[PDB]
RNA sequence: GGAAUCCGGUUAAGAUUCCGGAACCUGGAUAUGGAUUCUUCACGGUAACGUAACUGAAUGUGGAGACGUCGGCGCGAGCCCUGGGAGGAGUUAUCUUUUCUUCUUAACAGCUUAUCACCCCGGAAUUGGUUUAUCCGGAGAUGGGGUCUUAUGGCUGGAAGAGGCCAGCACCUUUGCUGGCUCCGGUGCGCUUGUGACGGCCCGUGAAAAUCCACAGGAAGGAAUAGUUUUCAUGCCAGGUCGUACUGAUAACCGCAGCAGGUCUCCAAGGUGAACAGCCUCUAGUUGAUAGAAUAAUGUAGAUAAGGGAAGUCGGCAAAAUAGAUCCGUAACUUCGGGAUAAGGAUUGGCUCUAAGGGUCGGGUACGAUCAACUUAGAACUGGUACGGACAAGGGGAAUCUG
């Protein structure tokens, strides 16, 4: 039943002014200000959160090493291993169809 | 106010020093007609209007 | 699970000053300790001995140091020995009676 | 059980608004809150999100359409007009 | 604010030329059911972090304070 | 919107600002170690992906910043409630293993930890899984095995040396000194709050930018008698300016004032009770408002009245009556949704019992031990027929005009 105060001069319950009540080693309650939560990075194609990437507030991605923000693949922390997978299927089959589309016109110019 | 600019804190700093009576040696001077501080301010009698 | 507890009382200091006797105090614990909520059901599971100057309960039933202090503060209120005799723990489960 | 006789979804409006006005709302609020068949994956997952926007749950394709139904009666015959007019070009 | 678990990695820490000081903190604890035992904490203060080595075997504690460098300003308790 | 700080102590008045300890960020130089390299710019995993690192300019793409409201559910934090134990204080005519209280752990860091999501094996109708809420599965379910996000929690470091509660000695003193103990649980439609997966709603779909990162690209620089790397570890330096006291209102603001007015917000204990209602208490804070003596009339505020019951009055104005919950019973009319708490009745305390509603554990390929809830129904007894015993708390109906 130990009531608590804000610690900064913003007295309003805004998004930037969240409070978690914690017990100190002095045996009293004191509020501590909690930052706003990090979202996960999302895939550039499907929009789903892509795994293996740490979820930090955006300037905290400059303090962590490369292996927290990537996976080991082409399009690592940008696309999501299933949009990458369909990208290789789609790149292969259309460019193979373009090889068909070249020579299928080379019979029409040979027989007109 | 309780979180101010320096241009507001400068004007209270001056008006704090003007919150005093006459120096009492003034009244002993030759041909001195100043009897009392006629520009004395108090915080609950006249607001500064900044 | 079965393990015995020992709660020792130091009644030395008032018996060398005449206000107090330990024999009736040792008697008072016997006919007032409640084992399963009933006085008189002690039956060797809780024993009260009296070394002349050191009262000692050896307990296997539920018997706390809070209850030894409560039964002692109840005893000194009956015999008007409060405002002279306090009940003080000097260690864990080793207690002491203060004069003055 | 059968909870209301004829008001259906529009029983949320209660006794207000005039019965013929709550009948025209009931014609369209059934249509805009119903699930429609996806053209692409063949599943019944297409729900409206906003007026004229119809998103499918799985395969996630969002198709533009009518404000309360997916395909309006006007735009269906349009699609078959332009279907007819295009095959007069390739023929 | 960081525990060191390798005792030989703790010994290379003391000669890292910023560690001017250390301390040896003794805590009276019990060995998980009964009797008390002596745990000791070897805290060296680096230039940006404090490293802690907890030693439960009080014999192995004795062979470690002699293994400290003679220049370290060891603060017992 | 946003780089990054916490605990403990200190003042006559300051503190996330001082002091002690312990961190993090930004900018900057930089040295050593680790890593890479004779296959020059790392390897492992089928894969999701892993990690102490593991070059990458122009330009391009993408993500974060970056987002509504309501409802119920799950989880966490703090608080409340409670058990044993270790201290202290109160009560003690009689009773009470009793009443109250201390039992605490910050930022930061290492390991571990999850709903969702994804991967591999397999290939499902006798359809299966599954939510409080019915959605998912050959576009690959159930199942077996895994990968990740680290909100969150656990352990360890920070850290017991601090803070707390006690005891024993000291003394015109600055004021001391020395001991202990600071422990293990339990519960939940609890309260506040954060959060997650969802669901409802919209002709309403609920900001922007700074800033940060990644990817693509491969310009370019690159070792073998020796280089490459500073998104890995440790090391070194600095971080300016301005505000920081106090009130925040029945006395610090605005109302000519020390004016019953007005003035944005955070925290939020116990009981009764559905309740952040009323009524009473704990912590904290006040005990301020010209007083003394009498108790005329008339006031103002609060009440009560025999018999009658609106006869008063422009008019039931004012007051009274009703009222919570449970069970029964509900009309005309209706736009079929309502009307409707219609109207109208009955019950209600205390005590002692009965019955029903649950959790977890061991069955080779029928049950039993145990633990923990307040909800509902019924029975006996009992009393100056009382029981929503204070508080709180609908008067109702038949119509007309009108929107």
Curated annotation (Swiss-Prot), chain B:
Statement: the UniProt record of this protein carries the keyword Cytoplasm: yes
One cellular-component annotation, GO: cytosolic large ribosomal subunit
Keyword Ribonucleoprotein set for record: yes
Family per record: Belongs to the eukaryotic ribosomal protein eL39 family.
GO annotation, biological process: cytoplasmic translation
Alphabetized GO MF terms: structural constituent of ribosome
Subcellular location: Cytoplasm
Predominant subcellular localization, coarse grouping: cytoplasm
Entry-linked InterPro entries: Ribosomal_eL39, Ribosomal_eL39_CS, Ribosomal_eL39_dom_sf
Biased composition (Basic residues): 6-19
Self-association state and partner proteins as the record states: Component of the large ribosomal subunit (LSU). Mature yeast ribosomes consist of a small (40S) and a large (60S) subunit. The 40S small subunit contains 1 molecule of ribosomal RNA (18S rRNA) and 33 different proteins (encoded by 57 genes). The large 60S subunit contains 3 rRNA molecules (25S, 5.8S and 5S rRNA) and 46 different proteins (encoded by 81 genes). eL39 interacts with YIH1.
Organism: Saccharomyces cerevisiae (strain ATCC 204508 / S288c) (Baker's yeast)
Functional summary from the UniProt entry: Component of the ribosome, a large ribonucleoprotein complex responsible for the synthesis of proteins in the cell. The small ribosomal subunit (SSU) binds messenger RNAs (mRNAs) and translates the encoded message by selecting cognate aminoacyl-transfer RNA (tRNA) molecules. The large subunit (LSU) contains the ribosomal catalytic site termed the peptidyl transferase center (PTC), which catalyzes the formation of peptide bonds, thereby polymerizing the amino acids delivered by tRNAs into a polypeptide chain.
Region named Disordered: 1-21
Pfam families given in the database record: Ribosomal_L39
Sequence intervals crossing the membrane: none
Curated annotation (Swiss-Prot), chain C:
Lipid metabolism among keywords: no
Main location: cytoplasm
This protein's UniProt keywords: Cytoplasm, Ribonucleoprotein, Ribosomal protein
Superkingdom of origin organism: Eukaryota
GO biological process: cytoplasmic translation
UniProt function note: Component of the ribosome, a large ribonucleoprotein complex responsible for the synthesis of proteins in the cell. The small ribosomal subunit (SSU) binds messenger RNAs (mRNAs) and translates the encoded message by selecting cognate aminoacyl-transfer RNA (tRNA) molecules. The large subunit (LSU) contains the ribosomal catalytic site termed the peptidyl transferase center (PTC), which catalyzes the formation of peptide bonds, thereby polymerizing the amino acids delivered by tRNAs into a polypeptide chain.
Other comment: Present with 60400 molecules/cell in log phase SD medium.
Complex formation: Component of the large ribosomal subunit (LSU). Mature yeast ribosomes consist of a small (40S) and a large (60S) subunit. The 40S small subunit contains 1 molecule of ribosomal RNA (18S rRNA) and 33 different proteins (encoded by 57 genes). The large 60S subunit contains 3 rRNA molecules (25S, 5.8S and 5S rRNA) and 46 different proteins (encoded by 81 genes).
This protein's name: Large ribosomal subunit protein eL22A
Gene that this sequence comes from: RPL22A
Residues included from the entire protein: 9 to 108 of 121
Curated annotation (Swiss-Prot), chain D:
Phosphoserine: residues carrying this PTM: 39
Keywords: Cytoplasm, Metal-binding, Phosphoprotein, Ribonucleoprotein, Ribosomal protein, Zinc, Zinc-finger
Subcellular location as annotated: Cytoplasm
Provenance organism: Saccharomyces cerevisiae (strain ATCC 204508 / S288c)
SUPFAM superfamilies membership: Zn-binding ribosomal proteins (SSF57829)
Coiled coil location: none
Cysteine pairings via disulfide bonds: none
Single annotated GO MF: zinc ion binding
Purpose of the protein: Component of the ribosome, a large ribonucleoprotein complex responsible for the synthesis of proteins in the cell. The small ribosomal subunit (SSU) binds messenger RNAs (mRNAs) and translates the encoded message by selecting cognate aminoacyl-transfer RNA (tRNA) molecules. The large subunit (LSU) contains the ribosomal catalytic site termed the peptidyl transferase center (PTC), which catalyzes the formation of peptide bonds, thereby polymerizing the amino acids delivered by tRNAs into a polypeptide chain.
Additional free-text comment from the UniProt record: Present with 44600 molecules/cell in log phase SD medium. There are 2 genes for eL43 in yeast.
Protein name: Large ribosomal subunit protein eL43A
Curated annotation (Swiss-Prot), chain E:
Species this chain originates from: Saccharomyces cerevisiae (strain ATCC 204508 / S288c) (Baker's yeast)
Gene Ontology CC, one term: cytoplasm
Described function: Component of the ribosome, a large ribonucleoprotein complex responsible for the synthesis of proteins in the cell. The small ribosomal subunit (SSU) binds messenger RNAs (mRNAs) and translates the encoded message by selecting cognate aminoacyl-transfer RNA (tRNA) molecules. The large subunit (LSU) contains the ribosomal catalytic site termed the peptidyl transferase center (PTC), which catalyzes the formation of peptide bonds, thereby polymerizing the amino acids delivered by tRNAs into a polypeptide chain.
A Pfam cross-reference name: Ribosomal_L38e
Domain of life: Eukaryota
Gene3D superfamilies the UniProt entry points to: 3.30.720.90
InterPro entries: Ribosomal_eL38 (IPR002675), Ribosomal_eL38_sf (IPR038464)
Protein name in UniProt: Large ribosomal subunit protein eL38
GO biological process: cytoplasmic translation; protein-RNA complex assembly
């Amino acid at each position: 039943a130990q009531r608590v105060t804000f610690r900064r001069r913003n007295p309003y319950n805004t998004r930037s002014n969240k409070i978690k009540v914690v017990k100190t080693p002095g045996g009293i309650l004191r509020a501590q200000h909690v930052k706003k939560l990090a979202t996960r990075p999302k895939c550039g194609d499907c929009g789903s959160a892509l795994q293996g990437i740490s979820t930090l507030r955006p300037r905290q991605y400059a303090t962590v090493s490369k292996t927290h923000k990537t996976v080991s693949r082409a399009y690592g922390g940008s696309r999501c291993a299933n949009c990458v997978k369909e990208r290789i299927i789609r790149a292969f089959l259309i460019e193979e169809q373009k090889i068909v589309k070249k020579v299928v016109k080379e019979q029409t110019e040979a027989a007109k | 106010a309780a979180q101010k600019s320096f241009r507001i804190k400068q004007k209270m700093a001056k008006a704090k020093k003007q919150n005093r009576p006459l120096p009492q040696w003034i009244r002993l001077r030759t041909n001195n007609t100043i009897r009392y501080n006629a520009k004395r301010r108090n915080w609950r009698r006249t607001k500064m209007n900044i | 699970q079965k393990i015995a507890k020992t709660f020792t009382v130091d009644v030395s200091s008032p018996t060398e000053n005449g206000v107090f006797d330990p024999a009736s105090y040792a008697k008072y614990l016997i006919d007032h300790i409640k084992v399963e909520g009933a006085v008189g059901n002690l039956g060797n599971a809780v024993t009260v001995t009296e070394d002349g100057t050191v009262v000692t309960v050896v307990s296997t039933a539920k018997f706390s140091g809070k209850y030894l202090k409560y039964l002692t503060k109840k005893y000194l209120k009956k015999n008007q020995l409060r405002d002279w005799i306090r009940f003080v723990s000097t260690k864990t489960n080793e207690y002491r009676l203060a004069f003055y | 059980a059968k909870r209301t006789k004829k008001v259906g979804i529009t029983g949320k409006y209660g006794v207000r608004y005039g019965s013929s006005l709550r009948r025209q709302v009931k014609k369209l609020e059934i249509q805009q809150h119903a699930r429609y068949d996806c053209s692409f994956c063949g599943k019944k997952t297409v729900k409206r999100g906003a007026a004229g926007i119809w998103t499918c749950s799985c395969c996630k394709k969002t198709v533009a359409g009518g404000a309360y139904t997916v395909s309006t009666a006007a735009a269906a015959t349009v699609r078959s007009t332009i279907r007819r007019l295009r095959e007069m070009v390739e023929a | 604010a960081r525990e060191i678990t390798d005792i030989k990695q703790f010994l290379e820490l003391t000669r890292r030329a910023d560690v001017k000081t250390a301390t040896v903190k003794i805590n009276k604890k019990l060995n998980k059911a009964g009797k008390p035992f002596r745990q000791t904490k070897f805290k060296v203060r680096g230039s940006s972090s404090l490293y802690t080595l907890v030693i439960n075997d009080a014999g192995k504690a004795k062979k470690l304070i002699q293994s400290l460098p003679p220049t370290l300003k060891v603060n017992r308790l």
